[PDB]
PDB file of C-alpha atoms and ligand atoms in Angstrom:
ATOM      1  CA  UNK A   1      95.134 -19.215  92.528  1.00  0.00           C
ATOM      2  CA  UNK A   2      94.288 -22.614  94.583  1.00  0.00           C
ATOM      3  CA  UNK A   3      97.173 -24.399  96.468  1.00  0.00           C
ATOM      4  CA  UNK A   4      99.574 -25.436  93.694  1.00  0.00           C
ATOM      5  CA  UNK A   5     100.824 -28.754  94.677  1.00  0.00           C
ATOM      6  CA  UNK A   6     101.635 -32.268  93.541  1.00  0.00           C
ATOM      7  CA  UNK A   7     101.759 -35.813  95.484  1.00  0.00           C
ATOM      8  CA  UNK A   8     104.452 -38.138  93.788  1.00  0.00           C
ATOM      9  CA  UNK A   9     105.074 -42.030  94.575  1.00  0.00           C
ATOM     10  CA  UNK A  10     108.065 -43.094  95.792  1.00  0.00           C
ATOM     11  CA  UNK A  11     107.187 -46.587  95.587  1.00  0.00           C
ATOM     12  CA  UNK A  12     107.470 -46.757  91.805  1.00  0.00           C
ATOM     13  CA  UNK A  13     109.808 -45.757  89.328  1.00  0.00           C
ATOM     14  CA  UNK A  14     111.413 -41.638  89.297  1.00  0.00           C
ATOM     15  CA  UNK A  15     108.762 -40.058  91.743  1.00  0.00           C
ATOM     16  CA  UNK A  16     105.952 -40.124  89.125  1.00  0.00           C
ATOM     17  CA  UNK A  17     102.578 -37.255  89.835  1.00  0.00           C
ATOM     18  CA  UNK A  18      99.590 -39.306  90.638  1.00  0.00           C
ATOM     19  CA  UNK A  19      97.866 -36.465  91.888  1.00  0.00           C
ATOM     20  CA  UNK A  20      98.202 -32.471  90.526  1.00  0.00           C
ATOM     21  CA  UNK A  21      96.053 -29.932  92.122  1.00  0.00           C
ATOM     22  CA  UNK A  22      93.410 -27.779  90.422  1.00  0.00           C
ATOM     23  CA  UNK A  23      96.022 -25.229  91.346  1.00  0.00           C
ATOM     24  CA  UNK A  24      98.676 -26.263  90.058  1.00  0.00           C
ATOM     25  CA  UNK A  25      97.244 -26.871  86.657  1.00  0.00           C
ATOM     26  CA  UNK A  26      96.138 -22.997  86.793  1.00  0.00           C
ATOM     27  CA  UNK A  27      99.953 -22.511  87.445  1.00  0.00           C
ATOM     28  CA  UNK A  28     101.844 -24.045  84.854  1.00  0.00           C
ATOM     29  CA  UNK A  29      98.859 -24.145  82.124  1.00  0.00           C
ATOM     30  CA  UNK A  30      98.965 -27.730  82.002  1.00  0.00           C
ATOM     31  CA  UNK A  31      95.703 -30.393  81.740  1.00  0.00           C
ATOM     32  CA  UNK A  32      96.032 -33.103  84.589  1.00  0.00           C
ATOM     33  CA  UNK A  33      95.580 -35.735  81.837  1.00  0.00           C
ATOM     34  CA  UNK A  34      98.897 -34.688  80.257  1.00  0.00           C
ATOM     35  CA  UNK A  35     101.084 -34.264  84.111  1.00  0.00           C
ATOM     36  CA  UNK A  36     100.025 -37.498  85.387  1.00  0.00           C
ATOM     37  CA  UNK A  37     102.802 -39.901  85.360  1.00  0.00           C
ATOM     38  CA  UNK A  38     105.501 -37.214  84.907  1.00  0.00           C
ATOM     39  CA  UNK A  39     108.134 -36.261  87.279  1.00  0.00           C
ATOM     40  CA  UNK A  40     108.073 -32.592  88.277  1.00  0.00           C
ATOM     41  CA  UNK A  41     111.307 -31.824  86.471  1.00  0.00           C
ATOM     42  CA  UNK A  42     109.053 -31.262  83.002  1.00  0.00           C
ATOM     43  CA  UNK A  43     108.995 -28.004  84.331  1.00  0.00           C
ATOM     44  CA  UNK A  44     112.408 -27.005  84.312  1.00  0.00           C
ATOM     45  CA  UNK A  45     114.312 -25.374  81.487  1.00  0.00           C
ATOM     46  CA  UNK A  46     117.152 -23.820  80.400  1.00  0.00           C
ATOM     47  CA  UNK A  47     117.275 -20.839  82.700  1.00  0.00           C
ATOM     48  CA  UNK A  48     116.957 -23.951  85.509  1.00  0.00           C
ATOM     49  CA  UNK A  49     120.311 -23.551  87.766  1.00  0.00           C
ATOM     50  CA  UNK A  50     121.476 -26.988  87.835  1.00  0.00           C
ATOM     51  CA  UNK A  51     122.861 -26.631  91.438  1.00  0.00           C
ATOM     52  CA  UNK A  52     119.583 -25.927  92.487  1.00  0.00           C
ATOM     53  CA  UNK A  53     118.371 -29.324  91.283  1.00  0.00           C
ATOM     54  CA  UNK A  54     121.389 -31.682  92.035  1.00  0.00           C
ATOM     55  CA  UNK A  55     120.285 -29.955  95.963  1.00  0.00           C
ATOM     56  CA  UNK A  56     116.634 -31.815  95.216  1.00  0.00           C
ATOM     57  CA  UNK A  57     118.082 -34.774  94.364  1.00  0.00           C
ATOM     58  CA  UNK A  58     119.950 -35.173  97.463  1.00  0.00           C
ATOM     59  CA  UNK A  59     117.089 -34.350  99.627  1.00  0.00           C
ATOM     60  CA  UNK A  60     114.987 -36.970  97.926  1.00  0.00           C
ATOM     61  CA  UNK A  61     117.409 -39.503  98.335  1.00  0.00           C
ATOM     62  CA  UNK A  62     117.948 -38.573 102.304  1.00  0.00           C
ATOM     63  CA  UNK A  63     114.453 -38.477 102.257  1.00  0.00           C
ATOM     64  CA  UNK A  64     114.630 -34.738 104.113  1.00  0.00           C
ATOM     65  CA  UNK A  65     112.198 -31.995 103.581  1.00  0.00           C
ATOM     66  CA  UNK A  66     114.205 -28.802 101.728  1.00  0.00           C
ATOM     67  CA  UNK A  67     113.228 -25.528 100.457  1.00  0.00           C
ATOM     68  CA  UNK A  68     114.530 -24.032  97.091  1.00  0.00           C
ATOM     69  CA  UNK A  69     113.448 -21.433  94.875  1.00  0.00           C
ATOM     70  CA  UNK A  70     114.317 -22.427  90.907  1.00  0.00           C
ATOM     71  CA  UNK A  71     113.309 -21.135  87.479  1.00  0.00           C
ATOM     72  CA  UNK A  72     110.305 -22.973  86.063  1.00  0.00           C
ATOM     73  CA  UNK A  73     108.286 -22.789  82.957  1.00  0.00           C
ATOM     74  CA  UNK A  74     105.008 -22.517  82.214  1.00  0.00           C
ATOM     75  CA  UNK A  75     103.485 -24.954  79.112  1.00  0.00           C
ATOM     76  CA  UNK A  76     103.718 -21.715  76.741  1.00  0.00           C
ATOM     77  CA  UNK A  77     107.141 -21.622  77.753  1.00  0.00           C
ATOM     78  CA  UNK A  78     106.958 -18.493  80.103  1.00  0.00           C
ATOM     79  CA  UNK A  79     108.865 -18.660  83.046  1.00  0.00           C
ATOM     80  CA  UNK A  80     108.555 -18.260  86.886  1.00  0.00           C
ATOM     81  CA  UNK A  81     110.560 -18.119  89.834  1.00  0.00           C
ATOM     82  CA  UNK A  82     109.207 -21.295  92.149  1.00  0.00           C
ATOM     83  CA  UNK A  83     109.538 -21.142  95.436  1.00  0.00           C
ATOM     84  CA  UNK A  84     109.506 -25.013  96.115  1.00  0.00           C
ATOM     85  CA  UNK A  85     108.109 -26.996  99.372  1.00  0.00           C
ATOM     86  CA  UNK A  86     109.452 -30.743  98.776  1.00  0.00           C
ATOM     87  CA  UNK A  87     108.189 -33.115 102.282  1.00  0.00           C
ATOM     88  CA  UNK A  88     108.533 -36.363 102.567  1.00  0.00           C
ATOM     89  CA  UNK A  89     105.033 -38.257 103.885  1.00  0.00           C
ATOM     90  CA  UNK A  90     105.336 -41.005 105.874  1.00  0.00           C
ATOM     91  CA  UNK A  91     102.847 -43.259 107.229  1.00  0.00           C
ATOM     92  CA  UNK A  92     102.100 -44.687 110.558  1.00  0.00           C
ATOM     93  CA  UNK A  93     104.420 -47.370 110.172  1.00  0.00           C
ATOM     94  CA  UNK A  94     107.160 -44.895 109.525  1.00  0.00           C
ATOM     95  CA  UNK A  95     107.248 -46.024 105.587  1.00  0.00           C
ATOM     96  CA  UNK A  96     108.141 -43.310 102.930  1.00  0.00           C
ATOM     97  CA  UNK A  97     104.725 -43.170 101.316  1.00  0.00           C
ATOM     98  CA  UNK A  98     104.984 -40.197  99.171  1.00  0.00           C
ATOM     99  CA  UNK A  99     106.297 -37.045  98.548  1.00  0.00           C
ATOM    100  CA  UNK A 100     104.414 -33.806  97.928  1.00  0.00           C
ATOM    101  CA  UNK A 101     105.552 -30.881  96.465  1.00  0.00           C
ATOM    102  CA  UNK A 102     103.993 -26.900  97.429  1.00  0.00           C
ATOM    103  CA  UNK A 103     104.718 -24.327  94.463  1.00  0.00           C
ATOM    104  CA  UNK A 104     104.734 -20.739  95.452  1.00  0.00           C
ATOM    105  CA  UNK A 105     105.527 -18.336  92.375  1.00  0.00           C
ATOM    106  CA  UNK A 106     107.605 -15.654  92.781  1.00  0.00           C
ATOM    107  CA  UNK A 107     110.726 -14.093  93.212  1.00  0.00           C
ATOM    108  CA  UNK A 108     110.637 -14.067  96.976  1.00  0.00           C
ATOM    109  CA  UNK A 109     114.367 -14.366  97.356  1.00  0.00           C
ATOM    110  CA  UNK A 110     116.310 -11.802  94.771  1.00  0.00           C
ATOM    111  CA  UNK A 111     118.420 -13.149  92.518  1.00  0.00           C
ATOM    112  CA  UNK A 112     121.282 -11.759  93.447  1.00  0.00           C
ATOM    113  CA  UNK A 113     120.588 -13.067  97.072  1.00  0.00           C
ATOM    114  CA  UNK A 114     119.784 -16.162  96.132  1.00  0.00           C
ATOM    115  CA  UNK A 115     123.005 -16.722  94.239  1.00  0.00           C
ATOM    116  CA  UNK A 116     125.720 -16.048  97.319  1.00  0.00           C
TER     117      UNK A 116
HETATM  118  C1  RBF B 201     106.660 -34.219  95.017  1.00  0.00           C
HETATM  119  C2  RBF B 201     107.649 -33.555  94.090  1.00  0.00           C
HETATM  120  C3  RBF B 201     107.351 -32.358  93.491  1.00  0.00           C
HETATM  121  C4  RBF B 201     108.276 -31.670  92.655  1.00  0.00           C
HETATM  122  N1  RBF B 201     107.900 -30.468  92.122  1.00  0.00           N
HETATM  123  C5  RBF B 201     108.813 -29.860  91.352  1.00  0.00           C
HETATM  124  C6  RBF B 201     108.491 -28.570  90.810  1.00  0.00           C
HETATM  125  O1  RBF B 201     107.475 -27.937  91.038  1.00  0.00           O
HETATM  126  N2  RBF B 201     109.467 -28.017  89.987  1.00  0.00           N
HETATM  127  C7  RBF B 201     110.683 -28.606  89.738  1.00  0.00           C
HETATM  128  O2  RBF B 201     111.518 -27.969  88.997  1.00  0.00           O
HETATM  129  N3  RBF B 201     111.018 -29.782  90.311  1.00  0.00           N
HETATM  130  C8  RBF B 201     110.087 -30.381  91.079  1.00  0.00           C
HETATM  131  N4  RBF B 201     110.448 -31.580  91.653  1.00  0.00           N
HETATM  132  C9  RBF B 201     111.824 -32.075  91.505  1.00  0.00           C
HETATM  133  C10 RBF B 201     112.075 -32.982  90.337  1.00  0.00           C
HETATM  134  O3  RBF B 201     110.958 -33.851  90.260  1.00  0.00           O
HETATM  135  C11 RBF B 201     113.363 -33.783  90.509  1.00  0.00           C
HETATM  136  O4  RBF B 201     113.300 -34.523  91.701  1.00  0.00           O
HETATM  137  C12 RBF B 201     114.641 -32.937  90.500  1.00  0.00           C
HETATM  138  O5  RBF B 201     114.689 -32.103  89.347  1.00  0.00           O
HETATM  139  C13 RBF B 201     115.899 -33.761  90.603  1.00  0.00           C
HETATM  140  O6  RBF B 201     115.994 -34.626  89.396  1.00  0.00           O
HETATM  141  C14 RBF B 201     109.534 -32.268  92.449  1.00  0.00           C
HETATM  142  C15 RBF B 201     109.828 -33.490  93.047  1.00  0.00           C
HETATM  143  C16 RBF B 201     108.880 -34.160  93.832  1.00  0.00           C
HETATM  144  C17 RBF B 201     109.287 -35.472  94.446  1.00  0.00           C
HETATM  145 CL1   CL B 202     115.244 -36.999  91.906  1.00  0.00          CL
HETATM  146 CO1   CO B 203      96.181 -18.018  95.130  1.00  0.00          CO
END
């Protein structure tokens, strides 16, 4: 599939997507017109390890890049493991400007690895 990724903005409310790419639609089996304005956690559920997400939260707030890999579900409810690339973007006058978030999907850490 294309790069899966989305761009948030910091500089309004909850990180909202104002950009999804063609990629990431193909991922989840959303329509752009229905992601834009969301925060990314619409695609969590309740397989979702909650630890895993309090960790994201953190890192936004530090404003520090982090790696995690977390359940995630597709619109028709199926899920995936996501292998998640969260980076802050700053611009040249060292301002947060956005975040943007890489999906990779797949198990790429076991489970039982991943949970030690
Ligand atoms: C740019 C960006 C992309 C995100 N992408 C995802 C994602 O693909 N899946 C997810 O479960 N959470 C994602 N999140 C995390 C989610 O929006 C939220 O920050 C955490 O769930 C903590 O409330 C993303 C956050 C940002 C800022
Ligand atoms: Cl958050
Ligand atoms: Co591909």
């Amino acid at each position: 599939m294309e790069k899966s990724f989305v761009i948030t903005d910091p500089r309004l409310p909850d990180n909202p997507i104002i950009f999804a790419s063609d990629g990431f639609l193909e991922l989840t089996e959303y329509s752009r017109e229905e992601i834009l304005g969301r925060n990314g956690r619409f695609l969590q559920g309740p397989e979702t390890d909650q630890a895993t997400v309090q960790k994201i939260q953190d890192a936004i707030r530090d404003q520090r890049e982090i790696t995690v890999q977390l359940i995630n579900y597709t619109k028709s409810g199926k899920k995936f493991w996501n292998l998640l690339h969260l980076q802050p973007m700053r611009d040249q006058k060292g301002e947060l400007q956005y975040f943007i978030g890489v999906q990779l999907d797949g198990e790429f850490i076991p489970n039982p690895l991943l949970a030690l």
